[PDB]
């Protein structure tokens, strides 16, 4: 089975519009959360979000962007960054059956699904809907809207698994390299940010509502007074590449993907069981002969979710004390984009030798006692890092990344 490495990355997130800005935010413990007039005006109780702070006007050519929802826009910009960061030019990656793309979103486009129905019900009917709603709203919009303009000839599809979406995309890309079917797979995802999608999470009671006056304090994973997650949007993309192919072209290699876990709880629809996460982490660690130095936890800042993951980590590691932090306390939860963005934060920590802080822990939850939860930026030579993602439906993904 071939070895898979990451040779490029790109990111558009609430804490930065490229990897340099994101790195600076992670080192400073900077929050990307702001007050949202749009969420408040819609009638929601949660008035905070992790928004992308970027004017995208004119960044994508008309013939390409006409098909795109915001998830695809964020993923496209992330892929442009990742292509450049990998040192790839069109002769190498375009029109190439050995080069593929696996990238998804959690929910397609709620905004454009609602637009289509609103337009259809207005006075102009079909003539108001226009011809571009399907590619904006379909679940595979992110892969379709990127594979076509980047002239991808290899694999082309989306994986969707709620908040594990883009972690499974990366793992599936790794499997394509392992099977020898592709030399390069671009993997990642995107997610739009809008009241159309956010209001259904508020209706479940899943979003933070008690910190609207202090938006940077609302996302507070492992804090005793956490009250739900803060919704976010953005995109990310990594270049997954076969090792000998990368070495032969003198690529820059961030890390090898040495473990990929994917499991299922088979239990509760909206709360993790813990048991599936234990198996997922153990699967991703199988055969890895170095300790996990740092774990980026899923850590959403919900009452129910945070304690279940802490218990799973304690069961997996027991004595050993991997450093742990939840970057969502800074970034919010970007849903289908979370897996790839958190893989990227972990790769930046590995590449630049530091642990990002778990912020806003004013009173540590009693269930977190004994764990090495890092609350201040800490320089450290890391070798092996792990990132967890979990989604509704009891779906779990874990990635383990290691220096070469």
């Amino acid at each position: 089975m071939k070895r898979a490495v990451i040779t490029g990355l790109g990111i558009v997130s609430s804490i930065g519009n490229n990897q340099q800005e994101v790195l600076a935010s992670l080192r400073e413990g900077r929050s990307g959360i702001t007050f949202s007039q749009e969420l408040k005006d819609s009638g929601m109780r949660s008035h905070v979000w992790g928004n992308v702070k970027l004017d995208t006007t004119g960044l994508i050519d008309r013939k390409v962007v006409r098909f795109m929802s915001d998830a695809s826009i964020y993923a496209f910009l992330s892929m442009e960054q990742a292509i450049a960061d990998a040192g790839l030019s069109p002769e190498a990656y375009q029109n190439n059956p050995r080069v593929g793309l696996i990238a998804g979103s959690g929910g397609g486009s709620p905004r454009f699904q609602v637009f289509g129905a609103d337009a259809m019900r207005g006075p102009r009917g079909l003539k108001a809907v226009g011809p571009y709603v399907v590619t904006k709203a379909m679940a595979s919009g992110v892969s379709a809207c990127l594979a076509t303009p980047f002239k991808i000839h290899g694999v082309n599809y989306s994986i969707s698994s709620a908040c594990a979406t883009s972690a499974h995309c990366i793992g599936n890309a790794v499997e394509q390299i392992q099977l020898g079917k592709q030399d390069i797979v671009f993997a990642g995802g995107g997610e739009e940010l809008c009241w159309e999608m956010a209001c259904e999470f508020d209706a479940m009671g899943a979003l933070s509502t008690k910190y609207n006056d202090t938006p940077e304090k609302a996302s507070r994973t492992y804090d005793a007074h956490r009250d739900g997650f803060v919704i976010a949007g953005g995109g990310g993309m990594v270049v997954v590449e076969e090792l000998e192919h990368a070495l032969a072209r003198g690529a820059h290699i961030y890390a090898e993907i040495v473990g990929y876990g994917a499991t299922s709880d088979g239990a509760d629809m909206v709360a993790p069981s813990g048991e599936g996460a234990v198996r997922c982490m153990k699967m991703a660690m199988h055969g890895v002969d170095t300790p996990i130095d740092y774990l980026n936890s899923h850590g959403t800042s919900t009452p129910v979710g945070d304690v279940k993951e802490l218990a799973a980590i304690r069961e997996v590691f027991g004595d050993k004390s991997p450093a742990i932090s939840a970057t969502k306390a800074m970034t919010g939860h970007s849903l289908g984009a979370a897996g790839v963005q958190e893989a990227i934060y972990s790769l930046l920590m590995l590449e630049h030798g530091f642990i990002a802080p778990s912020i806003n822990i004013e009173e540590l939850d009693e269930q977190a006692a004994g764990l090495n939860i890092v609350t201040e930026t800490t320089d450290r030579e890391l070798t092996t890092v792990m990132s967890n993602s979990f989604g509704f439906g009891g779906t779990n993904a874990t990635l383990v990344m290691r220096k070469l």
Binding site: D61, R62, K63, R66, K127, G130, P131, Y132
Partner: protein, 77 residues
């Protein structure tokens, strides 16, 4: 702006071409790269810009910049 200027602005924005390739005898499909979805939206965009309703039978004949200018010029009041 004149009708000609407004038509050319709409066509340029819709098809991703500078108001420079949008010459009067340019064909949307053969010269300006329009595909079958472009032709749908271009009709909508002209209808919106000039607050007119273009029947399908008439829209099918509007295949060049000049044909769009001619139609709008001839359907003001």
């Amino acid at each position: 702006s004149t009708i000609e200027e407004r038509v050319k602005k709409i066509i340029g924005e819709q098809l991703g071409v500078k108001q420079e390739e949008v010459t009067n005898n340019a064909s949307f499909v053969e010269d300006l790269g329009a595909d079958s979805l472009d032709t749908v939206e271009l009709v909508m965009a002209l209808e919106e810009e000039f607050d007119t309703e273009i029947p399908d039978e008439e829209a099918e004949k509007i295949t060049t910049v000049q044909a769009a200018i001619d139609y709008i010029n001839g359907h003001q009041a």
